Symmetry: D2
Subunit: 257 residues, 4 copies
Amino acid sequence: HHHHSRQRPVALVTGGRRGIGLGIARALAAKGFDLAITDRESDEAVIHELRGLGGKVAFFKSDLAAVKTHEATVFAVLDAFGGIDCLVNNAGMGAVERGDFLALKPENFDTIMDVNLRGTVFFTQAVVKAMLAADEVRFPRSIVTISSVSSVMTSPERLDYCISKAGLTAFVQGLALRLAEARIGVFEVRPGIIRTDMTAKVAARYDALIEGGLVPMKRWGEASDVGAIVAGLAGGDFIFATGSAIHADGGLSIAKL
Amino acid sequence: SRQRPVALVTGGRRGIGLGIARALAAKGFDLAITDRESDEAVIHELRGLGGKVAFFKSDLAAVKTHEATVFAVLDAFGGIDCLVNNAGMGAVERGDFLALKPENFDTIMDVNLRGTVFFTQAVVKAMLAADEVRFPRSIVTISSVSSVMTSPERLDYCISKAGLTAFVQGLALRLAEARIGVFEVRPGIIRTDMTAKVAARYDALIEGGLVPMKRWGEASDVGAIVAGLAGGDFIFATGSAIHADGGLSIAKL
Amino acid sequence: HMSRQRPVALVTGGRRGIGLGIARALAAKGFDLAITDRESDEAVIHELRGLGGKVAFFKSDLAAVKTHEATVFAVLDAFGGIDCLVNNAGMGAVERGDFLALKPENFDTIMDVNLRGTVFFTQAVVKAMLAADEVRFPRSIVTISSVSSVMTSPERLDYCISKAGLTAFVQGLALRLAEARIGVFEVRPGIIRTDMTAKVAARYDALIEGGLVPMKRWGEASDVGAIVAGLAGGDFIFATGSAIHADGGLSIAKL
Amino acid sequence: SRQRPVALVTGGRRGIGLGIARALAAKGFDLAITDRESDEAVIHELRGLGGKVAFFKSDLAAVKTHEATVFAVLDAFGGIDCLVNNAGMGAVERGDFLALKPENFDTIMDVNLRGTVFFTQAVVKAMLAADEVRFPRSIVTISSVSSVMTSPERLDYCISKAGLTAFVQGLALRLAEARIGVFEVRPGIIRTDMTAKVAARYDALIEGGLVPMKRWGEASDVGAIVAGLAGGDFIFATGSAIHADGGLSIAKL
Ligand SMILES: NC(=O)c1ccc[n+]([C@@H]2O[C@H](COP(=O)([O-])OP(=O)(O)OC[C@H]3O[C@@H](n4cnc5c(N)ncnc54)[C@H](O)[C@@H]3O)[C@@H](O)[C@H]2O)c1
Ligand SMILES: NC(=O)c1ccc[n+]([C@@H]2O[C@H](COP(=O)([O-])OP(=O)(O)OC[C@H]3O[C@@H](n4cnc5c(N)ncnc54)[C@H](O)[C@@H]3O)[C@@H](O)[C@H]2O)c1
Ligand SMILES: NC(=O)c1ccc[n+]([C@@H]2O[C@H](COP(=O)([O-])OP(=O)(O)OC[C@H]3O[C@@H](n4cnc5c(N)ncnc54)[C@H](O)[C@@H]3O)[C@@H](O)[C@H]2O)c1
Ligand SMILES: NC(=O)c1ccc[n+]([C@@H]2O[C@H](COP(=O)([O-])OP(=O)(O)OC[C@H]3O[C@@H](n4cnc5c(N)ncnc54)[C@H](O)[C@@H]3O)[C@@H](O)[C@H]2O)c1
């Protein structure tokens, strides 16, 4: 129960209490991963549900923006599981206030950059330190970062959100190179329009946009769509595809005229 | 009717296409192998992987023959669930663009781009008319990192593969409502007969760090990726491009 | 012996549309002009001569690659050298419709002109440029592709493919010509008011008015000409390999 | 009503920003120059070109000072026609990503990305409040090929520049109806203070052909490009990115 040769691979999913992160966690548990979930607060019903899929599941309280606590969080994961095979950088937030770029406030820019970009980058640094020190490597290893189609499609009413995600796109490319000899597959997943709490406030507009054809596959994405994709990348069949970006968007980001 | 999904793999007799065929067989697909060259010994070996396999002789460039080939695949299997556009050829000559000959440009374009486009058309006609759709469906097109990394000594090849990149995007839109996942796979430096003549120069480059993973790609690397996409988990990712290159195409300074 | 005193631009498909807007802009900047096209418009040539330089017409089918060497030699005989090549000649898809109905012969027609023809015409011109004994002016090759290189239209994939092939060609051409200090650029027009767009004016009208084009207007041939003339003047030599979108923002990916 | 257009060039006391300022002055612009520390001499160098030149002390990272800086510019010149976002800094330390310090990440992000974004915000407010628009208007942002080419030993620098790429795209949409051309310029390897400590590595790479044009870039190369875009001929190309790199960022195999 301390220092836990492991029989199952270990995925660390940030922001895994709900939404896309929970869909990812369910998919990884179904493919046979033990789960270390982080989030700002716990949901005991969630942990129970995930435990009903047959694997080991533990929750770790963490503010992704609090970079000074990341090393301790990674220590807690290692003490509970012995190693980390898959990191899913999922936790993130939308813009504090959508509106004219001329009204964008620096405090709001800072909040979202601190979480989505700065927090993700140094949480990844803390985990990679542990992965590179792993004495044994018996499972495929991956780092999957949930960015957004907003990395490559701009929304002028929330340029702080777009900038933070585009920064992740750049970070993934460099991280892939840094981890290539360690045989850690490094991938970017760009969700489009997914049914979660982050899109609930804009749900009516996105409804009509989806009926109008904005999304070529003409439906909302589900957290289980992103989860199936992430679990596919974490299984090891895509190791030689390190550096690839996957668009989990039903074709939304296909440029068309 | 059919109880196992059917993959049609062009150029599936050897190299990357054979790696893809093996990986799809392990994933539970029956196999329609097409190629302009026959090798029944390879077909026999594929049958050892547990599924049904049939071979169809086809020249990818001979677009007037594609309809009959697709009809023959339908006759044998009743339907097509996955198309892998793998058949292709390298440049006839490598050398100064100033010496590029239009006949050699034509040979490569007729196979890699024109042939792939209209062979895909013939298969899509069949897929859109499927009575039953019981398995995930996909069209996976093997282009190359040469779609996005230029080689001035073989611009005809690079152009043919860049054309495939554009075709894939439009095809994904056309087939989105039919729920056929449409993907591009860009192999980097893979150990096949296509790289055989330059195998010593690439051996040197791979060691020197040109490929961040510092190894040859294998047909089985591309096969595992293609089989991952064909299983259905990536349907909502239609239009995606996957680099099967150990990091080769990551732009770095 | 005394080399030419004005730079020479060869503009393919320069009889009308974007090619003519490019020709007018280059003539105003002091370029002599070698215009190629399938048919001549003598009134156009006279109009271009009104700007004060030498203008000469050369009948050429861009798809007829066996004739390109003779065309280039005829330009050299008349002008002594080529400083700027504008690859502008091109055609729209023969028929817009479902990809399932696309015909190989129509695919070939578009590919033979837009892609194959452009590539080997460029090859013929580059042979001449690399043999030039004197280089007194900035040199460039500017290729008019399209936003369709990077924005797909499933009802005319042959056209998109032909232009996406040009994008790849321009990147390798820029590498081949970097030591010769020939600036190689791609220009991607968006929706421009020419005979190529006249049949779909109604649909583009509404897209434009609705802000699909962020600048909310049709492009004109003079918009592309101003951009091309800017590139041909030499200030962009160190930007070789760059692509310019002449589209009022159309191709900015937005959500 | 002012009779010459006014360009505001950040970080314009040396290097690329000074080359841009020189190029704009030669094209008939008056110049408002900023930099962190005072400079009495750059005015006299630029004044030889015949226009009006003024220097303004401004820390680009100090967003609360930006409003006063812009007002000081308006007081001296009446309006701003062209903004060149040139000020920036390289990574505080190069080294393994594993050792990247958050404080150094913050310093570079505060200047290159956050500072640029909110200084543009302040300047744009002035431009949209203009009574008179007699000259072509533009905003040219100097990012880097590091926006699109990764350097794992300085990922903070790359991320800050990639953020600018996204910013410029959204800014171009925001200003499209105001007829303000919005452009990104990506320098490659330019001979300035910023490359001085790695000039030996870059000499070997440049001579080896990493840069296809096989020479160092100079401040006047970027300046000629930026002045080209500021002249109005590229207004219908708003949103375009120009690579000022001698072909460095052309992806090649
Ligand atoms: N939902 C979409 O349509 C969509 C589209 C593109 C990208 N994304 C990205 O997907 C990811 C998941 O978002 P979602 O849609 O599931 O939203 P969500 O709000 O439903 O779930 C996000 C989870 O992350 C947690 N989280 C947020 N900030 C955190 C912090 N500072 N520390 C720790 N945990 C934190 C939240 O508490 C929550 O449990 C985000 O990165 C988001 O930007 C979502
Ligand atoms: N090997 C690499 O490093 C590499 C890299 C990037 C892309 N690719 C692409 O991968 C694909 C497979 O190539 P490979 O490396 O396995 O080479 P390969 O030559 O070993 O195999 C190609 C197969 O396709 C068949 N084929 C060729 N021309 C054909 C035609 N006209 N009609 C029908 N079948 C035809 C051949 O008979 C052979 O069985 C090609 O599209 C190639 O361009 C290869
Ligand atoms: N109009 C637009 O909105 C738009 C957008 C993007 C790209 N383009 C491209 O701009 C270029 C110019 O087109 P345009 O809009 O001016 O159309 P256009 O039809 O008005 O003019 C094209 C000119 O090229 C000539 N030409 C065509 N095929 C030729 C051939 N085989 N050989 C020689 N000359 C030939 C024609 O005779 C004509 O004079 C083309 O490459 C086109 O694809 C146009
Ligand atoms: N030199 C290259 O090879 C290269 C390549 C790509 C991009 N760039 C970019 O070009 C721009 C100019 O850099 P350079 O090469 O001329 O280097 P430089 O150091 O010589 O010039 C940058 C100037 O900006 C000033 N500056 C820095 N931080 C500032 C701040 N907070 N507020 C105000 N002024 C500030 C510096 O004092 C200096 O005068 C930078 O954005 C740099 O990132 C340079």
